[PDB]
Amino acid sequence: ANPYERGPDPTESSIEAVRGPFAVAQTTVSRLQADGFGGGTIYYPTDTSQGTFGAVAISPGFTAGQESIAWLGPRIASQGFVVITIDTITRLDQPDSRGRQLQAALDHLRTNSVVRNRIDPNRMAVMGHSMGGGGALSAAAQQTSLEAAIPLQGWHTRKQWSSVRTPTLVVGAELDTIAPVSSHSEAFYNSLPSDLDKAYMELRGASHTVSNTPDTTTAKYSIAWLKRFVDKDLRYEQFLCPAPDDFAISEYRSTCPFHHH
Ligand SMILES: [Cl-]
């Protein structure tokens, strides 16, 4: 039995839900309290009876505040994760710096008095929008123990990601003119190792801002990816393999079936 499974057996509806099965609470990390990042909000399940949970850090993009990705916090955490949505040190920080800040936010959770006993510090993930998604890739390249990475309309000058060993879901926006998929998202996906567990999901008709307000497709597949890889939860592979049929997805590529033990 997989000791990391949390919550009831899933359905398409359960992964689409705005609130998942876990009631959540939150705590604020002030900029002063944060070492190596700009502060954030931690969302976490209050129920401890199923065990500890994986941890996820989420970064905004260039010029943007935490508020641009805040909706992801409770939507993911309520599926059984401890999630920190960060501010960066400055809004004009570059991608590799954002990756260091994502790692610093995860490291902060290890000693945070509200959540340190609620996390499994060995099961961590990174996500981010725009340069924050470039940051997520950067963090994975620097810390191969990360269990998942999810760049949302990622932006990075570095196009080569052959060193990544963290299962990665690359989410592109079809009509993105800021981080166009041909030069950013698709290039990142094509340079990830061919033997990595990975997927590329392009959002039909979407602009760069699709991640900045609730988007069910983004949420549902982020949830499924984090479950599958942070929790090793094979109940969630059904949503990822074979290719999803959602209207909102204009293209899907993957290395299905994914590896497991
Ligand atoms: Cl755009």
PDB file of C-alpha atoms and ligand atoms in Angstrom, residues 173 175-180 206-210, ligand 1:
ATOM      1  CA  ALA A 173      -0.973  29.103 -23.276  1.00  0.00           C
ATOM      2  CA  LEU A 175      -1.910  32.475 -27.770  1.00  0.00           C
ATOM      3  CA  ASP A 176       0.711  33.666 -25.269  1.00  0.00           C
ATOM      4  CA  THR A 177       2.728  36.601 -26.652  1.00  0.00           C
ATOM      5  CA  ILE A 178       4.807  37.140 -23.489  1.00  0.00           C
ATOM      6  CA  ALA A 179       6.233  33.626 -23.080  1.00  0.00           C
ATOM      7  CA  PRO A 180       5.297  32.170 -26.478  1.00  0.00           C
ATOM      8  CA  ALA A 206      -5.356  31.238 -23.727  1.00  0.00           C
ATOM      9  CA  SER A 207      -3.260  34.316 -23.091  1.00  0.00           C
ATOM     10  CA  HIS A 208      -0.359  34.738 -20.701  1.00  0.00           C
ATOM     11  CA  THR A 209      -2.736  35.830 -17.893  1.00  0.00           C
ATOM     12  CA  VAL A 210      -4.656  32.540 -17.819  1.00  0.00           C
TER      13      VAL A 210
HETATM   14 CL    CL B   1      -0.466  37.148 -23.938  1.00  0.00          CL
END
